């Protein structure tokens, strides 16, 4: 089938890292577009602190949403404003409610959706910026939408990303390609909350082994030069 092209992400470099302002925009698009139908329960508002939002900002975001907290004195379930430690709200109570809601289809959890799809971000980007009319001959079942990049060539998703879908606080034009770019960077971060630190540790390893290896090699050669300079002589009678 059709595989994704290799887009030149700012983080695709060996030592490059994610664009954290793009992560900040990506969280916004997640919260105001796909939070209605997708769950990211593995990540929590705590993780957002210091990577693309500050402490107070993340706290305000948590207070904006309301979550369920354990039973009160009367043994009754109740709502409360979310704090910095709650995980991201799940839009549907049980997965079956999710499947029955949209159309017999379960929106995959986005927490690992970048590392759970062959192609990574390039796929999901091409997924969102890939909707097109069916080619002549296809008789798409009602309630489905055509997306060539999706295996099965028939997404159950509706086109989520149109122009002016939201209002970025930075003021960047929320055009479709832009919005998809930040949502994909955010999704990569969600799937890999180590990408920043991984490259830093790798850089340290490279510039450190670049002197460790020649030195241990020199020690080996120094120790072995006793044998490698051996000069044999055979003197029979």
């Amino acid at each position: 089938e059709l595989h994704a092209p290799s887009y030149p992400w700012s983080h695709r470099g060996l030592l490059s890292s994610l664009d954290h302002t793009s992560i900040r925009r990506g969280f916004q698009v997640y919260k105001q577009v796909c939070s209605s139908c997708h769950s990211m329960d593995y990540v929590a508002y705590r993780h957002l602190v210091g990577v693309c939002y500050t402490e107070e900002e993340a706290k305000a975001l948590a207070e904006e949403v309301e979550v369920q907290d354990g039973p009160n004195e009367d043994g009754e379930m109740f709502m409360r404003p979310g704090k910095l430690s709650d995980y991201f709200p799940k839009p549907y109570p049980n997965p079956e409610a999710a499947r029955a809601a949209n159309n017999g289809a379960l929106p995959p959890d986005l927490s690992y959706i970048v590392r759970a799809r062959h192609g990574g971000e390039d796929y999901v980007f091409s997924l969102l910026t890939g909707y097109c009319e069916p080619p002549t001959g296809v008789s798409l079942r009602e309630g489905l939408y055509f997306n060539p990049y999706f295996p099965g060539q028939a997404i159950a998703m509706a086109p989520p990303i149109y122009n002016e879908v939201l209002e970025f606080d930075d003021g960047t034009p929320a055009t479709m390609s832009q919005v998809a770019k930040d949502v994909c960077t955010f999704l990569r971060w969600a799937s890999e909350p180590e990408h920043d630190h991984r490259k830093r540790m790798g850089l340290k390893m490279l510039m450190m082994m670049g002197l460790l290896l020649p030195l241990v090699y020199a020690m080996k050669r120094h120790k072995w030069s006793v044998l490698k300079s051996r000069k044999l002589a055979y003197r029979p009678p």
Binding site: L14, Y42, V43, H47, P108, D109, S111, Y112, R115, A116, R117, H118, G120, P151, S191, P193, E194, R198, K199, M201, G202, M205, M209, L212, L213, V216, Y217, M219, K220, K223, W224, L227
Partner: protein, 379 residues
């Protein structure tokens, strides 16, 4: 008045093991992998411990606990990916070790070679269970596919599966069972490795030339300790590159999906270090024959010392056998490539050709080549 190095019991054992042990002078770099195995083992015993310290074993908290180790535990992701890719490093070193033993005729050490085959089986089983542990889609479905082979065994076979599954399918029971087995097995591997070193020390290592080197022997400590340190540095370079720069290079992305028994991934492939055998499994339509060929693909190493017909021991002076050996290596690589691709034209016929050629090379081509070989040299 004496060295406590060569009089204290533990120190005497260590001294005879890797301080004053007479080693061949011309040992090439291919021998370093021996230690590169043990170090890997130690690393695998180490990191796995720190994984078992934040890993539950229930199907409702397996994947979640793994994600917890990756995202929340301080520096936990380093340990997790270090384990996942140190497994691949372990198997790369294992395959290169087996290749070295095959090429330089080290299988003449019958006890050490057989113990090595036992170690290979144990390591493969341990890695299989470990890959089952994180309870991904790949994990669950590969476990089902692999264990369902035992249904092919006549009579008892079905029962055996229900025994290992602890029920009717890979489920809650099997996950914890595999956790316990994956924990216990590496210590059995360590014991067998100690026995292996014992058996090897009773005869001494074999040099690349294949000839006895009792005249040109050097002490192990001043030379091969630093050689092994360099080997460990290189292996750490490769492993750390893998973990730090491209961790999900040798894995499969579908393993990052919670195991759902009601839906299978587009492809069901095992870990890479198993594909070479999986392709052989796929070669024969007869399921029982497939399982038998799967077992024989590894058990052939047992027969390998018997098939040795060449007057010489190694392959240093056997160009024809050298081309045969590299044909075998290319064949194994071909089987590994075939395993990944689905069961379609032309992968099916290529897989059958590769599987046939593997046994043809090991059992027939090599002994006949050695027979021609001796005749070409007056003996």
């Amino acid at each position: 008045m004496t060295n406590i190095r060569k009089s204290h019991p533990l120190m005497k054992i260590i001294n005879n093991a890797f301080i004053d042990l007479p080693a061949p002078s011309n040992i090439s770099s291919w021998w370093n992998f021996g230690s590169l195995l043990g170090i890997c083992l130690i690393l695998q015993i180490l990191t796995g411990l720190f994984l078992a310290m934040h890993y539950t074993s229930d199907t409702t908290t397996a994947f979640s606990s793994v994600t917890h180790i990756c995202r929340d535990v301080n520096y936990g992701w380093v340990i997790r990916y270090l384990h996942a890719n140190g497994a691949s490093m372990f198997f790369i070193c294992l395959f290169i070790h087996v290749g070295r033993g095959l090429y330089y005729g080290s299988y003449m050490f019958l006890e050490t070679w057989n113990i090595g085959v036992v170690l290979l089986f144990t390591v493969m089983a341990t890695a299989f269970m470990g890959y089952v542990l994180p309870w991904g889609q790949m994990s669950f479905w590969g476990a089902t596919v692999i264990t369902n082979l035992l249904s092919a065994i006549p009579y008892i076979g079905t029962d055996l599966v229900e025994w290992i599954w602890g029920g009717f399918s890979v489920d809650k029971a099997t996950l914890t069972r595999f956790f316990a087995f994956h924990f216990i097995l590496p210590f059995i591997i360590t014991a067998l490795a100690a026995v292996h070193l014992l058996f090897l020390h009773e005869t001494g290592s074999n040099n690349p030339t294949g000839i006895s080197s009792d005249m040109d022997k050097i002490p192990f400590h001043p030379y091969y300790t630093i050689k092994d340190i360099l080997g460990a540095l290189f292996m750490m370079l490769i492993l750390l590159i893998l973990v730090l720069f491209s961790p999900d290079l040798l894995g499969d992305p579908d393993n990052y999906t919670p195991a759902n028994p009601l839906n299978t991934p587009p492809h069901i492939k095992p870990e890479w270090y198993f594909l070479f055998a999986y392709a052989i499994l796929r070669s024969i339509p007869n399921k029982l024959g497939g399982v038998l060929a799967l077992v024989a693909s590894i058990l052939i190493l047992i027969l390998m010392p018997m098939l040795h017909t060449s007057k010489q021991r190694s392959m240093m002076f056997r160009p024809l056998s050298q081309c045969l050996f590299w044909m075998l290596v290319a064949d194994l690589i071909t089987l590994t490539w075939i395993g990944g691709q689905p069961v379609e034209h032309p992968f099916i016929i290529i897989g059958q050709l590769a599987s046939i050629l593997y046994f043809l090379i090991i059992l027939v081509l090599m002994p006949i080549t050695s027979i021609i070989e001796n005749n070409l040299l007056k003996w």
